[PDB]
Structure 1
Amino acid sequence: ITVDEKLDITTITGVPEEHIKTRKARIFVPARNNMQSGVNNTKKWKMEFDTRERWENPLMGWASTADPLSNLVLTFSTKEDAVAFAEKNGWSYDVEERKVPKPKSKSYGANFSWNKRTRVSTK
């Protein structure tokens, strides 16, 4: 069998060059591009790294660049394995929080009052 149960926090290295200690990741929730109202693009945690300089390429004006990562987003399942991926390869990060709104109390019929203020007109 050769099970040999032991314990160590798995920090793997050698596969990138230097950008372990240089950068800091970010875990957050994408929340409702507000030109419309589709809520399908919630429920999945994503990541994005540091943004570095974008200069002008002096022949066209293209957005040529250094900063070799700059485009890496993965699709996470939840907050639980969100941390566990950033530590398993081991570079710094910072975590946001999921925002869910009010439930909330909305009821038609109270928009026509005898003495209240909740009263609509000009419909």
Structure 2
Amino acid sequence: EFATASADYSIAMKKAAEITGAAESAMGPKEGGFTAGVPLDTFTRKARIYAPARTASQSGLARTVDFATTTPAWKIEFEPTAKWQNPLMGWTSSADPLENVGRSALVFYTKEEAMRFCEKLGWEYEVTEPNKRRTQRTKRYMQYGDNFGTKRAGVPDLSTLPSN
């Protein structure tokens, strides 16, 4: 039996990505940036390929690499450039064109897909593998019954009993 998110339109998205002839499209390095038509100094900047960790404030795991095959979780991020305050109002000003484009719009299923996008666009990239969660609990409090075990204070000595 096979049932891996088999009740939604994502079935019709996984295929249409493996249609023959279109599943083997490939370009040389930096070639997609030449035909993109954006200024060429944009590709002198550095990019980071990484999957963001779970927020500490909440316990849910949906925006992590646990659901990597279900949901795109890998991101492309750029270093910050200068910001200052507006003299009249105090609003935060910037001259960065890539200020929100990687964090809002570019999401990928795997690390290699984001690498392929960076390679064909000409961005130099560094890849950061996320830290793997550990599921095995401690030896103490491994199960619920270890809360009430004999490991709290040892086996009780029967020396204060009447008739000792």
Q: Which secondary structure state, in structure 2, belongs to the residue aligned with residue 110 of structure 1?
A: helix
In structure 1, runs of 5+ residues without a counterpart are 1-6
Deviation string 1:37-56 (CA, Å, 9 cap, x unpaired) is: 11101131011112011101
Change (3 A) 1:16 1:107: same
Rg comparison, structure with higher value: 2
Offset of residue 78 of structure 1: 0.6
- TM-score, scaled to structure 1: 0.79
Q: Is residue 40 from structure 1 mapped to residue 72 from structure 2 by the alignment?
A: no
Greater displacement, 59-68 / 12-21: 12-21
Alpha-carbon RMSD: 2.2
Q: Which secondary structure state, in structure 2, belongs to the residue aligned with residue 20 of structure 1?
A: helix
Structure whose residues are more often helix by fraction: 2
Match of 1:26 among 48, 52, 56: 48
Equivalence for 2:144:
108
Aligned partner of 1:16: which letter? V
**Distance between the aligned counterparts of 2:38 and 2:97, measured in 1?**
12
Q: Which secondary structure state, in structure 1, belongs to the residue aligned with residue 114 of structure 2?
A: helix
Conserved 8 A contact 1:24-1:50:
yes
Q: Which secondary structure state, in structure 2, belongs to the residue aligned with residue 26 of structure 1?
A: strand
Deviation string 1:68-95 (CA, Å, 9 cap, x unpaired) is: 1111131101112121111011111111
Q: Structure 1 vs Structure 2: percent identity of aligned residues? A: 44
- Which stretches of structure 1, 4 residues or more, deviate above 6 A after TM superposition? none
Change (3 A) 1:8 1:72: closer
- TM-score, scaled to structure 2: 0.61
Deviation string 1:7-64 (CA, Å, 9 cap, x unpaired) is: 972422342212212x101111111111111110113101111201110111000012
Conserved 8 A contact 2:74-2:110:
yes
Q: Which secondary structure state, in structure 2, belongs to the residue aligned with residue 93 of structure 1?
A: strand
Conserved 8 A contact 2:118-2:125:
yes
In structure 2, runs of 5+ residues without a counterpart are 1-25, 155-164
**Distance between the aligned counterparts of 2:30 and 2:52, measured in 1?**
28
Alignment of 1:73-84 (within 5 A): 73=102, 74-84=106-116
